[PDB]
């Protein structure tokens, strides 16, 4: 109906009246769809809705560590299509870079494995790749670490004969992407513990911190527990095509929900903040 401009305007208004509190972002596949990477669960268009040809027990099994061990072919097949390299960051990714340049980015917790936040120039210290990435590989048995080249080389083979195996225990080796059944990197909870403490300090001191959740269905734990764990005194924002997770289950009075595409949201926010000059330096850098 009406433009989302008025809603995004309130976010800008919040930042302007609460300038001394950096912003935390929690993102998912939605912020990379415009880059050509499909999300996972949107009806019809989500990746999990287009895997019938693999004839898996069910879509999510392609990222399940137990299934992978039983038959690694399905994952190797899909990995060929989602391996990083030919994708470029979106306007939303550059919004993260803009916040970093203005030094108002506290952290970006991402569930994406495309590493586009890093490619957009966001510093390693401000990024938490909660679901891992293709940066390196590891044995699902003993945990031995391997360079990414071992796996990448195999992906380029056709047909594949033998899959990468650990020379220490003999189990299969795969990219350090967190599969269902595996624990997330220690950095995830360690950093959230730190940022959560920081959020309390800010509210227990005043200016209210802001957490913006974008492009995720909050269907996977433990990442989905983040919005729930945000202190009540901290303002939550959800920019997503659908109201999801804790924003739908336990709507809080101060919650601000905006149904908009991530890039358009970013453009509107930059406009309302009046940071076009610095944003321009980034898009052309």
């Amino acid at each position: 109906t009406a433009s989302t401009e008025m809603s995004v305007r309130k976010i800008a208004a919040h930042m302007k009246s609460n300038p001394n509190a950096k912003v935390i972002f929690m993102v998912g596949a939605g912020i990379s769809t415009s880059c050509g990477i499909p999300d996972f669960r949107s009806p019809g268009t989500g990746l999990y809705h287009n895997l019938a040809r693999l004839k898996l027990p069910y879509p999510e099994a392609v990222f399940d560590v137990d299934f992978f061990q039983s038959d690694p072919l399905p994952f190797y097949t899909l990995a060929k299509e989602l391996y990083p390299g030919n994708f470029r960051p979106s306007k939303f990714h550059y919004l993260l870079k803009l916040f970093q340049d203005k030094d108002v980015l506290k952290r970006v917790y991402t569930q994406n494995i495309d590493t586009l936040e890093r490619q957009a120039g966001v510093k390693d210290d401000l990024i938490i790749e909660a679901h891992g990435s293709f940066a390196h590989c590891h044995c699902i048995g003993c945990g031995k670490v391997y360079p990414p080249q071992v796996f990448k080389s195999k992906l380029a083979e056709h047909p594949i004969k033998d899959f990468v195996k650990c020379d220490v225990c003999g189990e299969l080796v795969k990219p350090a992407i967190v599969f269902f059944g595996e624990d997330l990197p220690d950095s995830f909870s360690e950093t959230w513990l730190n940022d959560s403490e920081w959020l309390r300090e800010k509210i227990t001191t005043p200016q209210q911190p802001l957490v913006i959740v974008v492009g995720t269905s909050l269907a996977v734990y433990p990442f989905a527990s983040l919005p729930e764990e945000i202190p009540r005194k901290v303002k939550r924002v959800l920019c997503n095509l659908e109201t999801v997770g804790d924003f739908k289950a336990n709507k809080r009075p101060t919650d601000l929900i905006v149904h908009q595409y991530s890039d358009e949201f970013a453009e509107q926010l930059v406009e309302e903040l009046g940071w076009q000059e610095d944003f321009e330096k980034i898009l052309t850098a």
Binding site: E60, H131, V178, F179, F180, G181, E182, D183, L184, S189, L218, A219, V220, Y221, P222, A224, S225, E229
Partner: peptide, 10 residues
């Protein structure tokens, strides 16, 4: 929270 990566319970 922590624990193994999992699809939320329904």
């Amino acid at each position: 929270k922590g624990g193994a990566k999992r699809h939320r319970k329904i």
